[PDB]
Design a binder for this molecule. Structure first.
Ligand SMILES: Cc1cc2nc3c(=O)[nH]c(=O)nc-3n(C[C@H](O)[C@H](O)[C@H](O)COP(=O)(O)OP(=O)(O)OC[C@H]3O[C@@H](n4cnc5c(N)ncnc54)[C@H](O)[C@@H]3O)c2cc1C
Ligand SMILES: Cc1cc2nc3c(=O)[nH]c(=O)nc-3n(C[C@H](O)[C@H](O)[C@H](O)COP(=O)(O)OP(=O)(O)OC[C@H]3O[C@@H](n4cnc5c(N)ncnc54)[C@H](O)[C@@H]3O)c2cc1C
Lengths: 462, 462
C-alpha cells in the first residue's frame, strides 16, 4: 500500500542521490528508488570507469617519450585484464560507499523498478508496493541508442559504451561510429592502448558543436595519434564473417560519387551515436506527463514538469548531459523545495566541460560563432595562441596546445574559453569560476602569471 | 662618450627585457646592457632548465606505476647526459629567440658590464663608453649565496643551483642544505632520478613561510619519496675526503643535547640557503642610491629608487623573487613612464606561485595565520579536504592531495588557496584570477564542477 514520504526520488544516479542527500539533510523523509546499482551511469559505466581507462592510455602515450627523457624504452604489451579487474574493484568500492552514505543520512532505498500509477494523486509502484509523496523527482537518466535492423541490418552485432566497459581483452580492430565526445574518447583510449581504430564520422570533423578551433584541432590530433577518421561515412550494414565483422560503409564526400567499402576483420564496432532517455517504462502516460518527440521529459527553468509535485533533472531531460549538471540541479531543487528558496534553479550558462581526448579538451562558454550570433561580428573579438608545451621541447613526438578566448563588447568580457593541450583537464575549473563572475580580459591580464606553465598563456594572450 | 637614449635598462633578464619591450613598443629609444646571456637567471639557470629537469623526474616517478597500469616494468637506469645535452640545446634556442625579438623591436644591446659614474646626471659606463638616459632601470637581479670559509670551513667545496645546471652526471649521494622552494625542488629532482638525498633543514619542516598545511604536507611527501630530511641540522664544516666530501653536521633537536655526525662519501653538496642581490659592482655609492643592510635596492610602490630617473625591479629589490613578478613590474613601469599612466604599478597582493615538488604545490593569497593576524580568529574560516587522486586508485604507491581555502569575513571572501597534489601546477592560474577579482566562496560554489578532476574539489568544499 502507499507508504508516504516528503520526497520520492526515482533513480539513484547523479541527480537523484544529490537531490536526496541535500533534501534529507534539510530535514526531509526521502527514499530513493533504484532498479540497479547506485551511482547511476557515471559511476558504473561512465565518468569513473572512463577516467581510469583514460589514465591508462595516458601512460601508454608517455611510454613513447621514455627514451627521449634519458630512460630506456619498454618492450610493450599492455594487459587489459589486469587494469579491468582493478577498474571494476574500484567501482565496487564506490558502490559500497554510496549505500553507506545513503543509509548514514537515513534515506531509504526502494530497490526495484518504479512506474507511476493510475491514481489521482501522483503515486508510483515498486513491486506491487505503492509509495507516494508530495514531491516526486524523476532522475532516471538515459541510455545508449543502437540502430535497429529495420534500418541498419546487422546493427545489433555491435556494442555501446556499456559493452565497452564489459570488454575483457583489447580488441584487435575497433571501429567507432560517432563524432561526439564519447566517440572521441573511446577512439583515443582504444587507440592509445594498441587497437587499430577507425572513427566513422558523417562529416569532415568531430565535436562539431564545439568551437571551430576545437573541432579542427581535435580532428588533427586524432589523426596524428594513429586514429583513422573515416569522414563523410556511415554504415549500411554489418555482417558476422568468420574472422570478425564486415562493415559495409557508404562514404560520400560531397562533390564526388558515393563509394561503398567493406571493413573486414573488425573485432569491435562501437555505436557512439547517441543517448535516449529512460522514460517509456515509467508510465508517464498514466499522469499525462509531457515529453518531446524523443521521449525526454519536458521541464521548466526550475525542473518542474507540467504536473504539480513532479520534477525531473539530468540526462532524462536531454539538456547538458553531465554528472555535475545533474548534481547541480538536484541540489538547487532540494533547496528550493525544502528550504523554500523559490528562486533556487541551476543556470545552464557557462557550464564547464572537459573532454578526455589526447590531449584533453576544456571549454566553458560561447563558441565564437555563438557569440557572433548573439553579439554581432562588430562586437566579438577573439584571442588565440598555438604553442608546443615545453614537455615536448625534448621529445620527438609532439602535440600542440591551442587556446582561444572569445571576448565580447567594449570591456571585452570573456564569454568563452576553449583550448586543447596537456593539462587542459585541471586547468579549466578556475577559469570557469572566473568566467562566471563576469571577468573581463583585463581581470585575466592583471593576474601575475605562473611560470613555467601552459596556463600562463591564457593570462598573457595579446 | 655619452650616447643618449629614452630608456636605459641595466640587465637583460626577466624584468629588464619586458620593460624594454613594452617601452620601445610605446615609441621609446631603448638599449639593454647585459654582461652575459639574455634571459637572465630564469632562462639560463632557473625556471626553464628547472622545469625540464622536473618533467624528467616526473617520468621517473610514474615509471613506478607502470606495471600497476598493466604494462611491464622497465629495467631502469636514467642517463643524465642525454637529458642534459638536450636541456642545454633548448636553452640556446631560447637565447637565439631572445636576441631576435630584441633586435626585431629595435632595442640595442650594449654588451658588457654596466656601472654608474661620477657624473652629476645619472650616467653609466660600459667599456669606457658612457651612456645616459632620462630613465634608467636597474634589473640586475641576484645570485646564489654561499657561506664563506670564515664561518663554515670547507663551505666553498659545495655548489649552488648554478653548479647544479652545470652538473654532467647524476651524483651518487647528494646533500641539499636549505628549506625553501629551490632546496625542495633540487631535493626532489635529484631523488626521483636516483641519487641518495638528504635535505638539511634548521627546523622540523620545510617551506616554513607557506601555510602550515603546505609545509606539513610537503615535509611528509618528501620523506615518503625517499628523501631524508635532516631536521634541526646545519653544517659545521666540509672536508674533501678521497671518496667524496665529509659533511660534519651539528644536529640539535630542541629538548635534547647536540650531536655531531659526519656525512661521508657525499658526491654533491648543494647550498640552497639564499639569493644575494647583484649590486656591489654597479657603483650605487657614486649616486648615493639607497640599499638595505643586505645590498638590495630600496624602491617604492612604483619601483622608484631615492634618486629621480632611476628605478629598480625584480630580484634586485629582494621582494617576491619570481620571473612573472619582474615581468609584471617591468611592464607596469614602461607604461607609467612612456604612456604617462601615473598609477601604473604592480600589486604584490595575491601573486600566485607554484613550487615544483612532488606532487606540485600551488598557492595564492594569505596563509591561514596571515589572515588570522590581519582579520582575527573570529573572522577567519578555513575549509580543507584531503583525498587521494583517483590516478592512485589503481596504484600501490600513493601521494595525496590536500587543498585548503582561507575565507574571511561574513561573505567569506577567498583570501587564500593552498594545495599540493597532482595537477596542482596547471590548476592554479584560474583560481588566481578568481582570487584577484575578490571572489567569495559562493562564487566558487556556484560553479558547476568538472568531473572527474582534482580541481572540482575546490568548488565543492564544505
Ligand atoms: C561513457 C560515458 C562516459 C561519461 N563520462 C562522463 C564524464 O566524464 N563526465 C561527466 O560529467 N559526465 C559523463 N557522462 C555523463 C554522466 O554519466 C551523466 O550525465 C550522468 O550519469 C547523469 O545522471 P542522471 O541523474 O540523469 O542519471 P543516471 O546516473 O543515469 O541515473 C539513473 C539511475 O536510475 C536508475 N533507473 C532508471 N529508471 C528507473 C526507474 N523507472 N525506476 C528505478 N530506477 C530507475 C538507473 O538504473 C540509474 O542507476 C558519461 C556517460 C557515458 C556514457
Ligand atoms: C633555480 C632556480 C629556479 C628558479 N625557478 C623559477 C620558477 O620556476 N619560476 C619563477 O617564476 N621564478 C623562478 N626563479 C626566479 C626567477 O629566476 C627570477 O625571479 C628571475 O630570474 C628574476 O629576474 P630579474 O629581472 O630580477 O633578474 P635576472 O633574470 O637575474 O637578470 C639580470 C640580468 O642582468 C645581468 N647583469 C647583472 N648585473 C649587470 C650589470 N651591472 N651590467 C650588465 N648586466 C648585468 C645578468 O647577467 C642577468 O642576465 C628561479 C631561480 C633559480 C635559481
Amino acid at each position: 500500500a502507499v507508504a508516504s514520504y516528503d520526497y520520492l526520488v526515482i533513480g539513484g544516479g547523479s541527480g537523484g542521490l544529490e537531490s536526496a542527500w541535500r533534501a534529507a539533510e534539510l530535514g526531509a523523509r526521502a527514499a530513493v528508488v533504484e532498479s540497479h546499482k547506485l551511482g547511476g551511469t557515471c559511476v558504473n559505466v561512465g565518468c569513473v570507469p572512463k577516467k581510469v581507462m583514460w589514465n591508462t592510455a595516458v601512460h601508454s602515450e608517455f611510454m613513447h617519450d621514455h627514451a627521449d627523457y634519458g630512460f630506456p624504452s619498454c618492450e610493450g604489451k599492455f594487459n587489459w585484464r589486469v587494469i579491468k579487474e582493478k577498474r571494476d574493484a574500484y567501482v565496487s568500492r564506490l558502490n559500497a560507499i554510496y549505500q553507506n552514505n545513503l543509509t548514514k543520512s537515513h534515506i531509504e532505498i526502494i530497490r526495484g523498478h518504479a512506474a507511476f500509477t493510475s491514481d489521482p494523486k501522483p503515486t508510483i509502484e515498486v513491486s506491487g508496493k505503492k509509495y507516494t509523496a508530495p514531491h516526486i523527482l524523476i532522475a532516471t537518466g538515459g541510455m545508449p541508442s543502437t540502430p535497429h535492423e529495420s534500418q541498419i541490418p546487422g546493427a545489433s552485432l555491435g556494442i555501446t559504451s556499456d559493452g565497452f566497459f564489459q570488454l575483457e581483452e583489447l580488441p584487435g580492430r575497433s571501429v567507432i561510429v560517432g563524432a561526439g565526445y564519447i566517440a572521441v574518447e573511446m577512439a583515443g583510449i582504444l587507440s592509445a592502448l594498441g587497437s587499430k581504430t577507425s572513427l566513422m564520422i558523417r562529416h569532415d570533423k568531430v565535436l562539431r558543436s564545439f568551437d571551430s578551433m576545437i573541432s579542427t584541432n581535435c580532428t588533427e590530433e586524432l589523426e596524428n595519434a594513429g586514429v583513422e577518421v573515416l569522414k563523410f561515412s556511415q554504415v549500411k550494414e554489418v555482417k558476422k564473417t568468420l574472422s570478425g565483422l564486415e562493415v559495409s560503409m557508404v562514404t560520400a564526400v560531397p562533390g564526388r560519387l558515393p563509394v561503398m567499402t567493406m571493413i573486414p576483420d573488425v573485432d569491435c564496432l562501437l555505436w557512439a551515436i547517441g543517448r535516449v532517455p529512460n522514460t517509456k517504462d515509467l508510465s508517464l502516460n498514466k499522469l499525462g506527463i509531457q515529453t518531446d518527440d524523443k521521449g525526454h521529459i519536458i521541464v521548466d527553468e526550475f525542473q518542474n514538469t507540467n504536473v504539480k509535485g513532479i520534477y525531473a533533472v539530468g540526462d532524462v531531460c536531454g539538456k547538458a548531459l553531465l554528472t555535475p549538471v545533474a548534481i547541480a540541479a538536484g541540489r538547487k531543487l532540494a533547496h528550493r523545495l525544502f528550504e523554500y528558496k523559490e528562486d533556487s534553479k541551476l543556470d545552464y550558462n557557462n557550464i564547464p566541460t572537459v573532454v578526455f581526448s589526447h590531449p584533453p579538451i576544456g571549454t566553458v562558454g560561447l563558441t565564437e560563432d555563438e557569440a557572433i550570433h548573439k553579439y554581432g561580428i562588430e562586437n566579438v573579438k577573439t584571442y588565440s595562441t598555438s604553442f608546443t608545451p615545453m614537455y615536448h621541447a625534448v621529445t620527438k613526438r609532439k602535440t600542440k596546445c591551442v587556446m582561444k578566448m572569445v571576448c565580447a563588447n567594449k570591456e571585452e568580457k570573456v564569454v568563452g574559453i576553449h583550448m586543447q593541450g596537456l593539462g587542459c583537464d585541471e586547468m579549466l575549473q578556475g577559469f570557469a569560476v572566473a568566467v562566471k563572475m563576469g571577468a573581463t580580459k583585463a581581470d585575466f591580464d592583471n593576474t601575475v602569471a605562473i611560470h613555467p606553465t601552459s596556463s600562463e598563456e591564457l593570462v598573457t594572450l595579446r
